[PDB]
Amino acid sequence: EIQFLRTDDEVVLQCTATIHKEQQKLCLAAEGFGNRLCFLESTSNSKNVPPDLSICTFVLEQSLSVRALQEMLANHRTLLYGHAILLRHSYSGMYLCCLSTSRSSTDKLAFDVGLQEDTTGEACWWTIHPASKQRSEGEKVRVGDDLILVSVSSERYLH
Amino acid sequence: KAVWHKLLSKQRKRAVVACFRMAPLYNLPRHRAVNLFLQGYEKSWIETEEHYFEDKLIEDLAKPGAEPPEEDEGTKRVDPLHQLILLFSRTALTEKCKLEEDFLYMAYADIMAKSCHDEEVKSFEEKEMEKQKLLYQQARLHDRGAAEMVLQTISASKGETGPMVAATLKLGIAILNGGNSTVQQKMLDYLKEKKDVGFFQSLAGLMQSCSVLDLNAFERQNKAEGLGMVTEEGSGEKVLQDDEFTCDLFRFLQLLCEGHNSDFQNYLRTQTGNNTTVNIIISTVDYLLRVQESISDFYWYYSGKDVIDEQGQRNFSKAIQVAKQVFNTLTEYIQGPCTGNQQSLAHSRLWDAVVGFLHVFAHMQMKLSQDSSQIELLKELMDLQKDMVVMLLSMLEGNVVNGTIGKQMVDMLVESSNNVEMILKFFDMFLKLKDLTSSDTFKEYDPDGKGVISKRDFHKAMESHKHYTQSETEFLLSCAETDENETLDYEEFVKRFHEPAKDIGFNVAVLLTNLSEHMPNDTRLQTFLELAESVLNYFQPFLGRIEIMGSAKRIERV
Amino acid sequence: QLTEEQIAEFKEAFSLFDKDGDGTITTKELGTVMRSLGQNPTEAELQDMINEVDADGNGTIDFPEFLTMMARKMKDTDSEEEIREAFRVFDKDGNGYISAAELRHVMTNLGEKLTDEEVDEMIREADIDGDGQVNYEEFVQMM
Amino acid sequence: LFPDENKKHGLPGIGLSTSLRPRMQFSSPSFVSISNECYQYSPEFPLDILKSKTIQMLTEAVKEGSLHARDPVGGTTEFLFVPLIKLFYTLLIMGIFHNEDLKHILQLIEPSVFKEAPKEGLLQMKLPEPVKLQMCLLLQYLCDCQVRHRIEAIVAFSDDFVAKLQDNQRFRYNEVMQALNMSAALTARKTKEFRSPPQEQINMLLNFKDDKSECPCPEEIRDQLLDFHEDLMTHCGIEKKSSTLQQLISETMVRWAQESVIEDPELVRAMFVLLHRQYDGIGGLVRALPKTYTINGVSVEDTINLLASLGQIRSLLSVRMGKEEEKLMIRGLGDIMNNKVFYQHPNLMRALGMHETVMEVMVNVLGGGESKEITFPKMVANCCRFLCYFCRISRQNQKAMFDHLSYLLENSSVGLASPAMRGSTPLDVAAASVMDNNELALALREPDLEKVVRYLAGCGLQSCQMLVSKGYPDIGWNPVEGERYLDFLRFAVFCNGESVEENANVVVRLLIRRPECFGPALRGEGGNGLLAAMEEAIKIAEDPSRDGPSPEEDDTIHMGNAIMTFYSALIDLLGRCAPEMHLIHAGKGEAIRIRSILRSLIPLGDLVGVISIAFQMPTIAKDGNVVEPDMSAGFCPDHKAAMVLFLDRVYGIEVQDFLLHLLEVGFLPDLRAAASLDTAALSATDMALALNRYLCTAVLPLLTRCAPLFAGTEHHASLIDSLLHTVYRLSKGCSLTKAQRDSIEVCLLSICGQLRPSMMQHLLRRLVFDVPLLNEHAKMPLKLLTNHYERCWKYYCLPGGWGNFGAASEEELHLSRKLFWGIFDALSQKKYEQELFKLALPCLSAVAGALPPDYMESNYVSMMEKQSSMDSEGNF
Ligand SMILES: [Ca+2]
Ligand SMILES: [Ca+2]
Ligand SMILES: [Ca+2]
């Protein structure tokens, strides 16, 4: 009845904004050649401005667990909360990552988020967490639901 | 000389450290040693001293005393046991915010529980005598209102784990042991005719409050012994806080629906009379998913390590016992083709838990078989696998051809294909071991009955047998442990491996045959069938297959 | 009552464990020695066992307290017995005289690398008797 | 156990009891006196007359009741019996009855059972339910007396059993030690008995039971216990009159229950409790033995006083909190503290459960008037002080207090804001519970840390209500509460010099999850940084309008000092939470991640700047009195101590450029300031002491562990010379304690040894003028000279010298000759001190070896050697 987000599926990570008393839907976008840094493109103004979903679509290759990530760092599937995922940018073929090289945007704690070619390292892997209290860790992720990702390398959320 | 002084110093370091370490008891003053002796004497002797008086006390307390001798000129006097149970019931029925701990109830519930059970091949006469004695001893209590009291205490518990709840659960198990129909009927009538929602709410609260394996606490304990800290408690019960409580709580729920009590089985799923309904069937499968997740995480922690330590082995044993009890409880709810519970479990989260158990069984068996020290853990794990397959076979009860439950089950097997493949390879290998050891070529290698075969002779016997591949050869050599003489006892080897394969793989063979017959046109299933041909061919002499007219007025194969 | 050279031998034995030189054995200072001998202690075990010897209660045993624990035990003849105990076990030859050839062989156990020839230069200093092969008597001269 | 050879139970109560019991004191009720001591204690009464009349009246009541007269005394059987039996029970509890009186009054209860080798006792009289309950109470007391007699007999047996066991262990140990050697005795399984803790030794010795029989104790000693245990079992009843109180009670309770349907729930409860006690006599010992303690004869009086104080405190539970009750309980707690048994016997202290009584007395006060603020604040302080001292007494007390950690941290905010209350808050009790116990720190859980993290977040978010009510400026945060919540986290994460990584990872993760706990400066949005925060705090400290409330002095929380202490505590906590060095060498991802997170949170430049901040030196006034800068308000060396700890544990000093830059910017000025305050008058100043403590505990060991980095510093010539001169001046300083002097000696010996030979010429030109004095201060210079002249022997002897270093300039040779001659003369004309002579001889020999035998001194002498500028008078 209800679908479930599984591997090898193309999705867009969309975030909402409440700037100046209105709900604004924004999508995470990045383009391979040129600037590797990720930016946000408006999607609520689709009637006025056509969004560029080409740089917004991402592919979910693996949904391995944290222990599997630890083992492969030492060296077709349904996503479950608390697992490490590998988002691949469809257009560029470069995986999302925490660049760990901040641009010094006021808050010194945060780092920059972009695309990196190499798959090795813990920067590319991201752990999904259930925003909804009804959802639980280990439970399968619904297609329509809220997520809060955590960077393995930096222990920071996509903010 | 100076170098010699340094050389001498190295051993002199040991002397000073040794005398510092020296703490003989005689140096202690008299009072300190006397106090330590009092504590040691207490623990070693007074606590360990045991005497059996529960049956005597209950029999004396249940006797109506001299009623014809002294005339009350009133209502029939209640026996002292009846008065005690009535007091305990009234205390529970009294409205209080919390269930206060009471020593009298704690002691007397234990006494009554011991009285009920009062505990090589027993004959039929002795078995029937024991059943009659158990029935009479349980009647001695449920004729005075213990079945109602054990429900009232659980209701007043308000879903809070405590020794009071543990004693109540033990008493309930004692009175329900063997599937007491009269006690089941009394409990069900009580619950129905006073519409108790607190009982089910407290049951749900307790089942949420039940604990599982904790890698964090176990790793903290590991760091403790690694630093060298002595175990204050030998149990180390920070991991798996209350295994006894969890097992007792689930055994209570299993004995409640034993004997296929369709009425109580349905009433657990849906309390029709009550205003609010709680799904114990779904709560149980939720706890099963929690415990299987904990077990999988513990296995993942022990994946890299070559050998399992004793602490990990005992934690695995306790978790396996808990999971086995939960699986038995789920089986008893889906026994007696109870369609409602079958559908509920089919739509519930049982499938991914079984998938997880399948991976654990596939890898844990491979890991344990090589090492010869923890064969008991392997046996417990395979017993858990047997109970899981029994649960699946009960799930398939009353299934028509091309049934939806069977279809979901084949999807589960397809999802867990590789683990099923490895389990089937394991069983096929250790069942063909018997044909290998019965081959006459091996008897020609070892003509006399001493049975002391050499490693190389066994290796070339396997090649002469030719049925095994090189990978199978290496794996059997690894799983075969021999002394430095390379002298191995194939007799103990086969008695240690084949019979367990024989009596667990039968359930897998039966499940696969059932699925194959009830789905004659499922393409994916013939892959597992052709992978398990050898197991099926071995178990063909032992598999009895008949058809009967089932309770659903339809022909069923048994 | 303690014999004068025994305290002097207790002086050096005290300094053998008092690396810092202040005359106070801290728990960590004592602890590193016990790891060096192979045993792995907990901090509580070390601090528990150090309390019994500490009569003052300062947490660090001084030499006057150290003497009392030394007086607790019978080192009546254990000193030279251990000296002979080493001479017996260092006598791999068993001739009653210990050769210099295995002198380098046991000092390597601690990790020293002093050359083969130079030790028999030092054993010659030990061999004021001139034996050319060290006995217990030379060991007594050494100690 | 048994009065005579035949195993017959003695009459309950009758016997010799030696267990300590509360003292009986009474006061005469006289109203003509003008004294007030009589108000203490209960009024006197004729106890013997009351006892005799009670016995007579009970006898008459029993003899008359059996005939069932129409008119009893008072009109009813209940009125006749209940008050009289209540008075009898009270007298029996007080213990007035003795010997024949007890015999008669027990015969009045049951003639057949208690007759000593017709009329029916009280137990067969068809009594009402209140009378039955009052008789159940009497039977319970008799059973308790039997249990006490059993416990006393067990303690009697233990006296000689333990003595003979100890003698046997001495004999066995002597035989084993004759067999083996002390050095080899550390190993070998035979010595495991003696190396085991005493509790484990007794556990192994008491293996007589069953068939295993692996205990080393012989059969002659085994038989005594294998007889006493069965005697105790027989006395407990584990193996025609009933002849036993146990059987009498067991029959009576069941007979009553089957005779009548009891309506009163209390009677049913009492009867079944008593029946279970009769049928579970082993449980009585199982419960009593853990509460049984043994004391020597000398400690009896002090134990009695401690028990009286405990009784007073326990009895004050039943009365409501108030002025006089607070005074009484505070005085009693002080009495318990002053008692020596409180220290000598902590096991008895815990068995009596005084800590639970203090738990209850604190809970009552804390729960009383939560909205109207915690009334009786001195009481909470005294209770918390008693509890912290209880934790400090013994390790097991910390375990006992760890069980109430959830409540204490839930009430952690009772009195943190109020000053002068340090060590008297529930947070302090929690810190003492989880202080320096590695097992307890490991057992500490995550939600417990989360509670403290939330409290710290609130205190960093909003201001202090009490401070802004007293009139302090309303800054946007509360540093006073934070400096305590951070100290608790420090004690939780850091234990015994090592860092508990499991707790450190949780604390760091929660602190970065909620970043407002870091203070407004380090919050990250428009934050001026740690260095600017310290500068602003210094300025607000000099400003009196913002430092104080400006509407006592100890109550005055200087806002600048509070801010500075908060930031220092946060930095110290983070540095302690930093992963250990060996784990970074191993390369664990978690440790690397934590280290990187801490580096991101705190920059290097901020730490360097805060270290570069200078103090305010004390100065002498015209009159001749030193003016003392205030330490409740100002920049303190303890603040920089945490900065250096963070620098060492997080960033690490591994490069010589950074080492020298830090030495120039922050460390050397402090050394010079100490070397200037080392004057005679300024030495006793709080500044000299605090600065010396900070130096010798943080800076000097850091430079000692970073000693090898000083190898290739040829192009920094003047910096190392200044460092050596300042360190030597600090060593020559007088106010230093022994540990400080040792630290200075070790650091100077390491740095000088690692240093190049040519650089220490300026140190030699001061050492040659000081060493010949050969005073007590000259111990360290002799060793330094020995090590230097041994290491750099080729530099002086060989004409080429060290190939890279070179050779002497002949001025070093002249200085070495003067040193040699001065040392030789001073040793010649000074009195023999063995230590001085054992240290000076190697130095003299090393100098003689270093000096070439063909040495040519030059007709060069030096011009106006600046000896006066280094002489002690004025120090310049
Ligand atoms: Ca001392
Ligand atoms: Ca030799
Ligand atoms: Ca010789």
Author numbering:
A (entry chain C): 10 to 84, 110 to 193
B (entry chain B): 3584 to 3702, 3710 to 4148
C (entry chain J): 4 to 146
D (entry chain B): 1738 to 1854, 1889 to 2010, 2053 to 2364, 2377 to 2701
What do the authors of the reporting publication say about this deposited model?
Structurally, RyR2 is a 2.3 MDa homotetramer consisting of two functional regions: a massive cytoplasmic region, also known as the cytoplasmic shell, which comprises several regulatory domains (NTDs, NSol, SPRYs, RYs, JSol, and BSol domains) and the stabilizing subunit calstabin-2, and an activation core and pore region, which comprises the Ca2+ binding site and the transmembrane domains. Here, we solved the cryogenic electron microscopy structures of ryanodine receptor 2 variants linked either to heart failure or inherited sudden cardiac death.
We solved the cryo-EM structure of the RyR2-R420W channels under conditions that resemble the Ca2+-induced Ca2+ release (CICR) that occurs during systole. Our improved sample preparation and increased resolution allowed us to clearly detect the anchoring residues W3587, L3590, V3599 and F3603 in the CaM hydrophobic pockets, and to identify the inhibitory mechanism of Ca2+-CaM binding to RyR2. Binding of Ca2+-CaM not only stabilizes the CAMBD2 helix and the BSol2 domain, but also generates a conformational change in the JSol residues 1950–1960 attaching them to both the CAMBD2 and CaM N-lobe.
